[PDB]
Ligand SMILES: Nc1ccc(C(=O)N[C@H]2CCC(=O)NC2=O)c(O)c1
Ligand SMILES: Nc1ccc(C(=O)N[C@H]2CCC(=O)NC2=O)c(O)c1
Ligand SMILES: Nc1ccc(C(=O)N[C@H]2CCC(=O)NC2=O)c(O)c1
């Protein structure tokens with residue numbers, strides 16, 4: 299019964315029902331090669347994003363997946379990444395919890 | 404990809420996914436202390452970059468036959484978990500609080 | 510590790526004094542669970558009708574036991590057997606352990 303919206307503009311992005319426990323947990327704290335730290339929640343599906351660039355396997359936080367940057371398709375806020383090319387699931391999203399706002403449908 | 408664990412507060416090198424240790428079946432144990440704080444602890448055979456403070460205590464030990472010392476990040480002082488000693492097979496290991504770490508490339 | 514609580518929300522469920530300790534069992538899909546059996550428990554909500562399907566414990570039917578505080582599935586209540594008539598089989602990995 300709860301949806302996650304872009305914190306910057308309010309667009310609906312994903313749903314609590316779509317939380318996915320990748321490696322056992324839906325929440326992963328991660329750091330990128332530039333040493334930036336993010337708190338990522340995994341969701342099976344999303345809507346309202348815009349994925350940019352071609353998929354890349356380098357430094358993927360999730361083994362067996364390629365990633366693309368995900369922006370809010372409405373306002374352009376960087377909300378996380380889409381992952382593809384694996385199995386069970388084939389694809390999923392890692393969204394930056396602090397850039398979403400959770401709320402009632 | 405996601406092979407090294409760092410302190411989430413400051414980036415200090417702490418451990419590695421390769422060093423995770425399944426104690427009693429699982430590397431993950433969820434526990435609470437006398438103050439009712441719940442922790443999701445990951446067991447590691449090895450860790451670095453910590454500062455172990457105090458002398459070991461067996462009081463309230465979550466792990467049978469081990470005494471604990473508090474493990475802080477050696478750089479920033481954040482409480483990252485506990486070192487366990489005095490036990491058997493293994494004698495020693497680390498229990499680190501998963502959400503106080505950040506996972507990332509080597 | 511004398512009190513057992515819901516790992517998701519902390520609701521008190523049972524205690525080492527009530528234990529009967531791990532049983533390793535597989536569901537029909539061959540997934541591993543570590544079950545602890547307790548003679549007593551509290552703070553659950555038992556839902557639905559008893560079922561004998563794939564019961565791990567010969568002689569007993571099960572009902573689903575949820576955490577009464579947050580609704581997380583913590584295990585099952587077993588009934589209809591003998592010595593004892595009833596008990597709770599809770600999933601070790603869904604519980605948090607700590608002091609009294
Ligand atoms: N110079 C940079 C800056 C940033 C990144 C960056 O954020 N990468 C992410 C992409 C998603 C992922 O799973 N893992 C990462 O490490 C990167 O790969 C190179
Ligand atoms: N007043 C307090 C507050 C907290 C603790 C505390 O976190 N103890 C931990 C230490 C590690 C352990 O295995 N078990 C615990 O229960 C404590 O022992 C006393
Ligand atoms: N979609 C399902 C259906 C059933 C189970 C499952 O764990 N069944 C248990 C019920 C208790 C028991 O004694 N034996 C079992 O095999 C499950 O894990 C998923």
Ligand SMILES: [Zn+2]
Nearest residue numbers: 304307370373
């Ligand atoms: Zn937006």
Ligand SMILES: [Zn+2]
Nearest residue numbers: 410413476479
């Ligand atoms: Zn630190």
Ligand SMILES: [Zn+2]
Nearest residue numbers: 515518576579
């Ligand atoms: Zn609960």
